[PDB]
């Protein structure tokens, strides 16, 4: 591979690279609206939350902090833009 | 590695200044030693009085009798052992006669198979030893 | 051996010191 | 060949799929990665047959560009490609080396089997590594039927194909001989070739 195109890399390899070693660094994280089955309000939470987020009114717990992406509870939506 | 900086002149100058002393040639010619221990005291030649004729064994593998003379320097009283270079020139050197001796060729080093003799006879009785060896001068 | 020569040296330093302290 | 007359036909796909030329094993080379399509669930890599054909024509163009057909040397040390290189030599007029390659036929001029070819087609880059390395001391290009794990230490034209199966290695020599004759003009490319691909295949001693 002597003539590999560095200015126009395939999107399958840019997502493979580390979030810093990419052509232009971009986070692997995102935000998401969590809708608990008990209430109707949606809460915008971070994927790698690292804190114990709660819904408005203290209905239940939305996600739990982990070493990576936060682990959501049962019956929740995510993947917003 | 080395320091390549714009303001490292003192660091480089002091490093070379202190590392030159590890060079035995530079350190020998930049200290009080090796100049007072030198019997000539920094001179190329020196006159002395022949104390006695001495034969020095040639080192291995050679085997011969090096005809030398024990000389006492007049300038400082030190007793050295020169070397009568040519063949049979020891017979020209009398007893208690003034002779001009010089280095053997190397700077304070023993030349050839002779163990420690680092000097050689040049003149004798104010007459050069090369003129007596060739018969152009007498006495 | 370089270690026993080192041991003979330290046994010689200890003698030169005691011989030097006697005339101190 | 980027033309419509040189495209892979449907009859060529049914031969490649039956011979298993698209199955190249579990190991992969970093210089053969461009020819691989996708790795299956059982570790076997799939060779891109579209890129296999383009490298196959590119090899045929390099063979027909040699005026004297005897200046092309086809070599196969492994028995699976010994019959395939002897039939290729009779069809193309090349000098075959199917037995044991004596080290010195390219550099030692006083040898009996000393040759000076202009192109060196190789069945396996590993089984035939000796003529590859010896084709470096003399300015001789080389073509090889490189597998997924085959090295390209001196291969100038690598044809990505399964050079392990007998029906696959025999077909790659049948496809190349068919294309060399089509570019020379011996066969018209309009009607199917008279030679059956099973002529180049290797026969086990228990069956022959």
């Amino acid at each position: 591979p002597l003539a590999k195109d560095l200015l126009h890399p395939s999107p399958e390899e840019e997502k493979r690279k580390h979030k810093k070693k990419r052509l232009v660094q971009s986070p692997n994280s995102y935000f998401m609206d969590v809708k608990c089955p008990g209430c109707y309000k949606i809460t915008t939470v971070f994927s790698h939350a690292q804190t114990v987020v709660l819904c408005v009114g203290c209905s239940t717990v939305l996600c739990q902090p982990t070493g990576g992406k936060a682990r959501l509870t049962e019956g929740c939506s995510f993947r917003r833009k | 590695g080395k320091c390549r900086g714009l303001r490292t002149a003192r660091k480089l100058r002091n490093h070379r200044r202190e590392q030159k002393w590890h060079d035995k040639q530079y350190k020998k010619a930049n200290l009080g030693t090796a100049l007072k221990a030198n019997p000539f005291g920094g001179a190329s030649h020196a006159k002395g009085i022949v104390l006695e004729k001495v034969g020095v064994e040639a080192k291995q593998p050679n085997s011969a009798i090096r005809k030398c003379v024990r000389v006492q320097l007049i300038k400082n009283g030190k007793k050295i052992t020169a070397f009568v270079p040519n063949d049979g020139c020891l017979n020209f050197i009398e007893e208690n006669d003034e002779v001009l001796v010089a280095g053997f060729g190397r700077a304070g080093h023993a030349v050839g198979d002779i163990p420690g003799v680092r000097f050689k006879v040049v003149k004798v009785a104010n007459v050069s030893l090369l003129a007596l060896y060739k018969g152009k001068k007498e006495r | 051996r370089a270690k026993w020569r080192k041991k003979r040296m330290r046994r010689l330093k200890r003698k030169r010191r005691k011989m030097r302290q006697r005339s101190k | 060949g980027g033309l419509d007359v040189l495209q892979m036909k449907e009859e060529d796909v049914l031969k490649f799929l039956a011979a298993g030329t698209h199955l190249g094993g579990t190991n992969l080379d970093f210089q053969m990665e461009q020819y691989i399509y996708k790795r299956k669930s059982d570790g076997i890599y799939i060779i891109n047959l579209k890129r296999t054909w383009e490298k196959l024509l590119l090899a045929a163009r390099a063979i027909v560009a040699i005026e004297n057909p005897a200046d092309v040397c086809v070599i196969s040390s492994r028995n699976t490609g010994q019959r395939a290189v002897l039939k290729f030599a009779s069809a193309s007029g090349a000098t075959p080396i199917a037995g044991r390659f004596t080290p010195g036929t390219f550099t030692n001029q006083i040898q009996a089997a000393f040759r000076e070819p202009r192109l060196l087609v190789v069945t396996d880059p590993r089984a035939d590594h000796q003529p590859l390395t010896e084709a470096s001391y003399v300015n001789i290009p080389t073509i090889a039927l490189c597998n997924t794990d085959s090295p390209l230490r001196y291969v100038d034209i690598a044809i990505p194909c399964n050079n392990k199966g007998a029906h696959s290695v025999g077909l790659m020599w049948w496809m190349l001989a068919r294309e060399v004759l089509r570019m020379r003009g011996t066969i018209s490319r309009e009607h199917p070739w008279e030679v059956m691909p099973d002529l180049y295949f290797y026969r086990d001693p228990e069956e022959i």
Partner: protein, 215 residues
């Protein structure tokens, strides 16, 4: 002369006009008669060193002589070959044959102004063999070869009239000295200079052009 290789048959039959055709295609020269056919007129050889190497056997020492021969036409072509044989005459004879098969084209340039024929090296090249490295440096037209006696014999036979030379390593090893110098001379015509940036116009190889004559 009965040619064995295809390259020797084309030279014998006057198909290849000069030696630069072989250098253009980087073809191996396996027959010394090919060299004597082009440069055999003004070719001069020199015995650099007769080096007796000994193999420790029960018969005291088995002395075998190795010779270093420098071959060059004194303009653009120089060669260096070594041969270790039992006899001194055979070692010299075999080294001359290897010194012909190793003849490389010597590229010569100018120092500053480009007037007349080239006199010095085109740029600074450094050849290495073992621990010895020999750097060739351009020099004015009247400077000459400022070098040791060993590289001077190689630089004069390579047509280099002027050259500044610097050598580092065990230059007392005439084998590694001459081979590093010959490596520095061989690095010419391979150093990409701005005057060689033009796209190369590919020609037909001697095996391709005369493929009908070779049948």
């Amino acid at each position: 002369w009965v040619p064995v290789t295809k390259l020797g048959r084309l030279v014998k039959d006057m198909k290849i006009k000069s030696l630069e055709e072989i250098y253009l295609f980087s073809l191996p020269i396996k027959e010394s008669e090919i060299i004597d056919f082009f440069l055999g007129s003004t070719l001069k050889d020199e015995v650099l060193k007769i080096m007796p190497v000994q193999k420790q056997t029960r018969a005291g020492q088995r002395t075998r002589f190795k010779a270093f021969v420098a071959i060059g036409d004194y303009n653009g072509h120089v060669g260096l070959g070594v041969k270790c044989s039992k006899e001194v005459a055979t070692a010299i004879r075999g080294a001359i044959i290897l010194a012909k098969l190793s003849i490389v084209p010597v590229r010569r340039g100018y120092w500053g102004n480009k007037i007349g024929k080239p006199h010095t090296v085109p740029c600074k090249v450094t050849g290495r063999c073992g621990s010895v490295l020999v750097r060739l440096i351009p020099a004015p037209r009247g400077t000459g070869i400022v070098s040791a006696p060993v590289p001077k014999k190689l630089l004069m036979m390579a047509g280099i009239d002027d050259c500044y030379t610097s050598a580092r390593g065990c230059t007392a090893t005439l084998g590694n000295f001459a081979k590093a110098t010959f490596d520095a001379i061989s690095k010419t015509y391979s150093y990409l200079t701005p005057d060689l940036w033009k796209e190369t116009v590919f020609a037909k190889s001697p095996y391709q052009e005369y493929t009908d004559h070779l049948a």
